[PDB]
């Protein structure tokens with residue numbers, strides 16, 4: 001299973017997991033403060049991940065940055 | 070299982086999931102506001118994804134950009 | 139499973155799914171307007187995909203363009 | 207499963223599927239008009255694909271071009 | 276399964292499939308006229324393929340040309 | 344089997360935190376690292392996300408990233 | 414499923430010979446190739462070694478090799 | 483199944499195995515002296531490895547060096 | 552779907568010798584090749600080691616090696 | 621299964637196998653003399669290998685040298 | 689399953705197979721004379737291979753030479 005690396009570039013960045021299955025909703029929100037790193041998998045319960053705030057992102061396809069505000 | 074990365078380049082980008090199976094319709098529309106990133110898999114319920122609006126997309130195959138009206 | 143990427147370079151592009159199995163026919167036609175992107179897999183029900191209209195297409199084998 | 211991309215370079219190109227199994231015959235002819243693209247897999251029912259007419263073909267082994275009469 | 280691509284460089288090219296199993300013979304010959312392309316798999320029934328005639332051949336090992 | 348991450352602690356008191364796999368998300372273990380220790384940690388049946396706090400040098404299949412403390 | 418060998422006959426009468434898989438080893442088939450003909454042949458339940466006699470150009474996973482008459 | 487190489491740059495290096503499962507504890511500590519190498523797998527019982535002391539370390543992602551107290 | 556070895560005989564009377572898989576080790580089959588013939592031989596249920604006597608050009612997954620008379 | 625190459629650069633190099641499982645123990649020590657090569661796998665019984673003495677070592681991750 | 693290529697650079701080279709399992713001992717010693725090539729797999733019975741004497745060795749990891757007494 002693939003994972004995504006997320007480095008928070010400011011306080012209060014949110015890594016949100018959406019539910020796998022016929023229903024789509026947020027099941028969890030992980031708050032990252034500046035400089036913190038989260039390495040997060042796709043799992044049985046999480047089939048999509050949303051990032052809100054300024055962060056540097058690595059995936060198998062390369063780097064992308066989310067932008068706050 | 071494969072996933073796409075979607076960075077909204079403007080407000081109100083829509084990431085639309087089409088059902089796996091004999092029938093084809095939309096089962097969920099994730100809206101993204103400017104700067105937000107979504108990392109989204111193909112799953113048991115989603116076998117085709119559609120993007121409406123200005124966004125920067127990465128897939129196994131490289132980058133593509135969606136353009137809004 | 140493999141997928142194709144389709145960006146509509148014009149209004150009214152169709153992505154057509156043909157049926158998997160001993161019979162071959164159209165079961166669904168996804169309309170795309172200019173600028174819209176569809177990412178679409180091969181599936182239990184779709185074993186061939188047809189693009190009609192002006193689109194930029196990426197597959198595992200590279201880029202190919204359909205023309206109006 | 208592998209697949210092949212076929213761009214029709216002229217009207218009336220045919221992508222023919224030959225049946226898998228002990229017997230070999232044509233089971234379906236998809237007609238393409240100039241500019242239309244087909245992406246078609248090898249399947250339980252098709253284990254060989256014939257292209258008739260001028261078209262641009264990509265497969266895992268590269269680009270090949272069919273020509274008409 | 277792997278597959279072979281055959282472009283007919285003249286009329287009357289032959290793509291011949293040999294039977295898989297303890298015994299060996301031709302089970303189907305597919306005629307290819309000049310310019311026609313066949314993409315053919317190895318399968319439950321075909322474990323070798325012979326090409327007779329002038330053709331352009333691609334496999335996973337590269338290109339090879341048959342001569343008439 | 345599954346992927347792993349390399350974490351070198353660039354100061355004392357670095358925290359490598361495992362998040363629970365499954366429908367609920369909580370911290371189950373926090374492995375503390377002092378300066379210069381290396382931890383090589385996998386994703387597992389119990390761990391489906393890892394969070395790093397403090398200044399550390401990180402390697403994954405996607406390349407290096409560095410965490411920074413406050 | 415299963416490596417294959419490409420054999421181009423560089424003269425008439427080239428022989429591609431299959432050896433039997435199993436505890437016992439013998440020739441079970443000899444496929445005659447005349448000048449310019451190409452044979453693409455798999456390893457199989459029945460054939461676990463292939464011998465080429467006569468002048469031919471051979472491609473395998475490992476490269477080209479040439480047999481001499 | 484993945485493995486790490488550990489070369490001890492000083493006496494007393496410490497390769498610590500952590501238990502796989504819902505509980506996390508060290509279950510084995512293999513000490514290395516200067517110049518000794520260990521090649522260790524991830525296993526049914528070890529899902530994380532900790533290195534203490536000055537060592538040179540190769541994993542699939544590259545070399546990393548641990549530095550001691 | 553195992554590895555195979557390409558052997559080209561550079562002189563008459565080269566010998567490709569197959570050793571038995573199992574607790575017991577000895578030769579079960581000796582294929583003689585004369586100058587210029589090529590043998591392409593797999594590892595199999597019955598052969599888990601191959602020995603080449605004489606002058607031949609050998610290709611494997613790991614590159615070319617030459618056996619000498 | 622992965623394996624490792626050990627060429628002893630001096631007499632008396634030891635390649636030690638640690639047991640797979642909940643318990644960790646040396647179960648075999650192969651002595652290598654100057655210039656002898658061992659190619660050894662991870663197995664059902666051996667899930668860690670320790671090299672003691674001067675040797676040149678190749679693994680999937682590259683070359684590393686143990687020193688006496 | 690992996691294999692090793694061993695070319696004898698002198699007479700009396702020894703390719704020695706160690707037993708797979710809880711016990712470790714020699715079960716077969718295959719002698720090579722100068723110029724002979726042995727291509728030998730890992731197997732249900734052999735999980736470690738030792739070479740004595742001057743040989744050129746190729747594995748997945750490269751070329752290593754054994755030096756004889």
Ligand SMILES: N[C@@H](Cc1c[nH]c2ccccc12)C(=O)O
Nearest residue numbers: 017041043046364365367368391
């Ligand atoms: N309990 C969650 C933890 C998690 C993994 N990846 C995530 C991404 C976003 C949010 C939560 C998560 C799960 O197993 O799915």
Ligand SMILES: N[C@@H](Cc1c[nH]c2ccccc12)C(=O)O
Nearest residue numbers: 020021023047086109110112115
């Ligand atoms: N519950 C949906 C969530 C989802 C995943 N990928 C998506 C892409 C588009 C829209 C929704 C989704 C699913 O499991 O499939």
Ligand SMILES: N[C@@H](Cc1c[nH]c2ccccc12)C(=O)O
Nearest residue numbers: 089090092093116155179181184
């Ligand atoms: N419901 C369709 C959706 C789909 C996936 N790929 C397609 C390609 C073309 C048309 C429709 C589709 C299916 O699972 O097959």
Ligand SMILES: N[C@@H](Cc1c[nH]c2ccccc12)C(=O)O
Nearest residue numbers: 157158159161162185223249252
């Ligand atoms: N129903 C057919 C459709 C098809 C797939 N690939 C093809 C190639 C050529 C012609 C038809 C097809 C099938 O599953 O096989």
Ligand SMILES: N[C@@H](Cc1c[nH]c2ccccc12)C(=O)O
Nearest residue numbers: 226227229230292315316318321
């Ligand atoms: N019915 C044949 C079709 C075929 C596939 N590949 C071929 C190559 C040559 C001749 C026929 C074929 C089969 O499944 O095997």
Ligand SMILES: N[C@@H](Cc1c[nH]c2ccccc12)C(=O)O
Nearest residue numbers: 228294295296298300302320321
């Ligand atoms: N050996 C039989 C049956 C057979 C085995 N494999 C085949 C592939 C194709 C056609 C027939 C066969 C025959 O030649 O008739």
Ligand SMILES: N[C@@H](Cc1c[nH]c2ccccc12)C(=O)O
Nearest residue numbers: 295296298299322431457459460
């Ligand atoms: N009936 C033979 C056909 C064949 C395949 N590969 C070959 C190589 C040489 C000679 C014959 C063959 C088989 O399935 O094995």
Ligand SMILES: N[C@@H](Cc1c[nH]c2ccccc12)C(=O)O
Nearest residue numbers: 361385387389390501502503529
């Ligand atoms: N017992 C834990 C060990 C572990 C693995 N990865 C981790 C990451 C962080 C913290 C602990 C761990 C587990 O199997 O999951």
Ligand SMILES: N[C@@H](Cc1c[nH]c2ccccc12)C(=O)O
Nearest residue numbers: 433434435461569592593595598
């Ligand atoms: N019947 C033998 C044929 C063979 C394959 N590879 C070989 C190498 C050497 C000698 C004989 C063989 C087998 O299946 O094993």
Ligand SMILES: N[C@@H](Cc1c[nH]c2ccccc12)C(=O)O
Nearest residue numbers: 499522523525528640641644667
């Ligand atoms: N008995 C331990 C041996 C081991 C493998 N890798 C390790 C890493 C650290 C400590 C011990 C080990 C096991 O199978 O897990």
Ligand SMILES: N[C@@H](Cc1c[nH]c2ccccc12)C(=O)O
Nearest residue numbers: 637661663666708709711712735
């Ligand atoms: N009988 C041992 C032999 C062995 C394999 N790899 C080793 C590494 C070191 C020492 C012994 C071994 C085993 O199968 O595990």
Ligand SMILES: N[C@@H](Cc1c[nH]c2ccccc12)C(=O)O
Nearest residue numbers: 571572573575576705729731734
């Ligand atoms: N019968 C032995 C032959 C063998 C294979 N690899 C070897 C390496 C060394 C010595 C003998 C062998 C076996 O299956 O294991």
